[PDB]
Amino acid sequence: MENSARQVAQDTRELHLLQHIKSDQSYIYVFVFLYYRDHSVRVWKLTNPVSISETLDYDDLINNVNRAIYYREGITGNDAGDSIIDKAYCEPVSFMIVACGDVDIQTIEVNIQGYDEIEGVGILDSNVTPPYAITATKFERKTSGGYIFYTYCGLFGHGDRGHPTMAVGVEKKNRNAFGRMHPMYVAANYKRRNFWAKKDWWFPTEGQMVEQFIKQQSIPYVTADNVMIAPCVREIRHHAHY
Amino acid sequence: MENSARQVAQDTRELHLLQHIKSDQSYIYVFVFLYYRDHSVRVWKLTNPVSISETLDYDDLINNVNRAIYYREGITGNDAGDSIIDKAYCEPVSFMIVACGDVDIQTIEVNIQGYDEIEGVGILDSNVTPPYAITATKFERKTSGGYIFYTYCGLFGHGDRGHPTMAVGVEKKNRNAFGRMHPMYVAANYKRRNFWAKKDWWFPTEGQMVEQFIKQQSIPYVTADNVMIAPCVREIRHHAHY
Amino acid sequence: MENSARQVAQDTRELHLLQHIKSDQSYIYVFVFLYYRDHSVRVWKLTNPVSISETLDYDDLINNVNRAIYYREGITGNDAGDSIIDKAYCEPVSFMIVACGDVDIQTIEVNIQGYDEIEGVGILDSNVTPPYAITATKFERKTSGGYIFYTYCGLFGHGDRGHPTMAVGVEKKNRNAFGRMHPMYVAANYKRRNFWAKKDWWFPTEGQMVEQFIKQQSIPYVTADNVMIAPCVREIRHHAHY
Ligand SMILES: Nc1nc2c(ncn2[C@@H]2O[C@H](COP(=O)(O)OP(=O)(O)OP(=O)(O)O)[C@@H](O)[C@H]2O)c(=O)[nH]1
Ligand SMILES: Nc1nc2c(ncn2[C@@H]2O[C@H](COP(=O)(O)OP(=O)(O)OP(=O)(O)O)[C@@H](O)[C@H]2O)c(=O)[nH]1
Ligand SMILES: Nc1nc2c(ncn2[C@@H]2O[C@H](COP(=O)(O)OP(=O)(O)OP(=O)(O)O)[C@@H](O)[C@H]2O)c(=O)[nH]1
Ligand SMILES: [Mg+2]
Ligand SMILES: [Mg+2]
Ligand SMILES: [Mg+2]
Incomplete structure (x- = not known):
């Protein structure tokens, strides 16, 4: 039964799932989860075939379900x-x-x-990459079978970043030398610079989000109590791997 | 009278109109027309000198003139x-x-x-190009004199795509080899990546739209009864064409 | 005291400020100030490490603090x-x-x-660069110590551009030959194409804006009575300059 063609069809599906990650046919994603005192969650999907680049402005980061200039001028x-x-x-x-x-x-x-949105003491002194923006090494590397994903959590606090804005960007991993914006490729990916614009949802609790969205869309996730919610595709290979 | 310099000035205008299409000095356009049960039309202009790339989110595709979480959660x-x-x-x-x-x-x-906005069964299996997105051959090629344009129509239906989101992208035709994002050109077109952001209007009926907008802006169009509304520039050439 | 190491630390700070402008570590900016009959000001920050490209739509250019289809159809x-x-x-x-x-x-x-947003008599005749869009030579070049900035002012009027839309774009100055979108660099800057999306504020008067925003963020500015409000970093150099 293990070598039945039906099982090998299942094998093909799961090899496809793992190889699809590295393929040019998949998207990369950054999901930004925002947790409010009311226990609700606002979620942003950032996505692109090769290059994510997005600003989440203040109005994108506040709770727009359980909801001006008199206040806005005070944070301006x-x-x-x-x-x-x-x-x-x-x-x-x-x-x-x-x-x-x-x-x-x-x-x-x-x-x-x-x-x-202005880093530092004035616009002409702002740095494009403040040290705290170089967050790569502070992400936690999570594994679920052959899948790999990365999480970074933190508090906004009660200071300036308690009225937050966010710039987020990331590239698709390229394990070889032909750049995804090399001249022979650039126009095809430039045509997809806005596939897709940032997209948001809201959920009354994390637990309800996990059932109705995280699980339904098979989005890798870690709950507040540190439980991994993610699809798992066990590795298939006919020979040893280094 | 046919060779009066005044007529040749008219000839220059019309040769200009046809050649302007192929010139780097013109825009490319995608117009998205959305037809509602109330007979009104919401219209999006997507435009760029060389490369159109846009998402039309759900709030962009619904009628915002003849007009939430309780419903939105049900389509989430x-x-x-x-x-x-x-x-x-x-x-x-x-x-x-x-x-x-x-x-x-x-x-x-x-x-x-x-x-x-998530193709397929889960985000890690989504394809960047689902087969139904490769719509090129399903467009109808319309001609109006020397002008050429393309139309694609369809129904959203009463299923998932009845709560639609759309990614649309297209490149300017390049009949020769110097790429419009070649290194010697890329920065000049990158500076125009948002010339112009998506722009919308709304009209009470198609017929009123045709009079007040389609005709006034000389936008190529096809009505519901299959009538072409488009400017026509008859071809001018001093020698035979293959 | 002039050669005390503490003073040289101050010197380092000010050399840094002037050289930071030319460095890849700084942003370029375009600020769009919009002045209303009520004397209030709406301000847009456009910014990017290397390439600014933005549309300000009609709803971005009207006063959204001291504030539809019946009117919108008349300007459509x-x-x-x-x-x-x-x-x-x-x-x-x-x-x-x-x-x-x-x-x-x-x-x-x-x-x-x-x-x-449609230049000229119809979409197929629109020019990507109408003559009035080539505004470089009409800017006034302002200096404040070693800092250089540019201003361009005007009236919207009571005609079509009294219901304005705006496309704005500019590149970071490159005084040498390695392009900031050369293939070896393009992906890193493409990842920052939306650092940062256009950002707006509103202020009750210009004078209050100058105190609470222009001065606080050290944004170069010129008031209505033609007074320069800008930081000043005096030039430091150990040898003559041509
Ligand atoms: N990273 C960083 N954050 C700062 C700095 N200065 C102020 N903050 C703010 O500090 C806040 C978090 O710092 P905490 O020390 O935990 O204080 P908090 O819980 O926010 O409450 P506060 O004591 O009012 O700041 C964030 O909201 C930041 O905006 C700074 O120099 N660096
Ligand atoms: N292309 C495609 N559309 C699907 C699929 N499954 C469901 N649909 C939906 O089918 C709808 C149109 O299909 P029709 O068979 O004409 O049905 P309908 O008029 O929308 O009414 P329903 O019977 O409720 O679906 C669209 O709204 C789609 O979202 C699918 O597998 N492929
Ligand atoms: N640059 C330019 N502006 C034009 C043209 N035709 C009309 N305008 C409009 O003219 C207005 C400014 O021109 P002015 O002559 O100062 O007139 P105004 O103060 O706006 O009042 P009006 O006399 O009603 O136009 C702008 O709002 C433009 O939209 C044109 O051909 N070129
Ligand atoms: Mg703080
Ligand atoms: Mg259906
Ligand atoms: Mg006028």
Whole structure:
């Protein structure tokens, strides 16, 4: 039965799943999970065939389901507000970044700023890559069978980054030399620079999100109690691997 | 009178119009027309000098003139809704894609998904190019004098794609070898990657749209009864063409 | 005291500030200031490490603090409106473009259109670069110590461009030959194509904006009475300069 052609059809499916990751036919993904004091979750899908590059502005990071200038002016300039509310309830408590598919985690950047998006003391001194944006080594490398994904979690806090904005970018891993934006390829990937624009959802709790979305879309994930929710494809190979 | 310099000035204008298509000085366009049960039309202009790449999210495809989480959760995960409305009235009935200007129709992709934008059974198995996205050969090639344009129509239906999202991309035709993203050109076109961002309008009926917009902007179009509405520039040439 | 190591630390800071402009580690910026009849200002930050490319649509250019189809249809097609309001109060009176950081002003384009974004008489005749979009030579070159920035101001008026849309793009100055989108570099900058998406603020008056934002973020600026508000870093060099 182990060598029945039907089983080998199953084998083909699972070899396909693992090889699809490295293939040019798959997407790379960054999912940004935002956790609010009300226990709800706002989720952003960032995705592209080869290169993810997105800004999540303040209005993208606050809770838009359990929900202005008087407050906004106070997070625009120092002491410039006219609001009796010091900190908006709907600003996120924590985040998790999940990088999955064929991401080269070494190319990831997660650059979290305050409301004005301006790093440092003034615009002409801003650095394109502040040290805290070089987050690659701080991701945790998770494995589920032959699948590999990466997580990075943290708190936004009660300071400037409690009114957050985020720039996120990552490249598809290239294990060989022909660049996915080499001149013979660039136009085909440039045509897909917006496949797909950032996409969001909201869920009342993490547990309900896991049942209705994480599991249904087979998105790799780690819960608050540190449980891996991810598909698992066991490795198939006819010969030893180094 | 046929060889009066004034007539030759007219000739210059019309030769200009036909040659402008192939020139680097023109835009390529994809117009997405969305037809609602109320007979109104929402229209998206997608445009770029060399490379169109856009996502039309669910909120871009529904009728925003004749117009949430309780319903949205039901199209996010299976059986996860809390809405007495099964299908929103404002979801589009049908679409037409019009590709015009110097498009290379062979490079077009029209990738229509459900609300979650995720092709296939799970994110790690999604294909960047599902077979139904390779729509080039299904477009109808329309001619109006020397002008050429392409149309593709269809129904969204009452299933997952009745809650649609769309990725659309196409390149400008290059009849020669110097790529419009060759290293000596790439930076100049990269600087125009967002000339222009997707732009929308709404019209109460197709007939009123044709008078007030299709004709006024000289946009090639085909009505519901299959009538071509397009400018016509008759071909001018001093010698036979193969 | 002039050669105390503490002073030389100050010298290092200021040499850093001037050299940071030309370094790959800085951003380029275009700020678009929009001035309304109510004396308020809406401000857009456009920014990127190497290449700015943005559309400011009509809803981005009108006053969204001191604030539809019946009017919108009238600026979509000629005489197609159903509004008793001829011109919306919230459309901007004037603009100023501030290009700063290491911009190559020779690559700037400021293309202002009417509501439909369509240059010329019809879409197939639109030019990607209308003459008025080649604004480089019309900018005023401002200096503040070793800093250089560029301003361009004007009125929107009471015609088509009184219902404005804008495409803006500019490249980082490259004083040498290795292109920032050369094949060996392109993927790293493509990954940052959306660092950062366009970002806006609003201020009740120019004077309050200058105190709470222009000065706080050290953004180069020129007020309505023609006063330069900009940081100043005096040039430091140990030898004569040509
Ligand atoms: N990384 C970093 N964060 C800073 C800095 N200065 C202030 N912060 C803010 O510090 C916050 C988190 O720091 P914590 O020390 O845990 O304080 P908190 O829980 O936010 O509450 P506060 O004491 O009010 O800051 C974030 O919201 C940041 O915006 C800084 O220099 N570097
Ligand atoms: N192309 C494609 N469409 C599918 C598939 N499964 C379901 N659909 C949906 O089928 C719908 C159109 O199919 P039809 O057979 O004409 O049915 P309908 O008019 O939408 O009404 P239903 O019978 O409820 O599906 C679209 O909304 C699709 O989302 C599939 O496997 N392939
Ligand atoms: N550059 C340019 N602007 C034009 C043209 N035709 C109309 N305009 C409009 O003219 C307006 C500014 O021109 P002005 O002569 O100062 O007139 P105005 O103050 O806007 O008031 P009007 O007399 O109603 O136009 C802008 O809003 C433009 O949209 C044109 O051919 N070229
Ligand atoms: Mg803090
Ligand atoms: Mg169906
Ligand atoms: Mg005018």
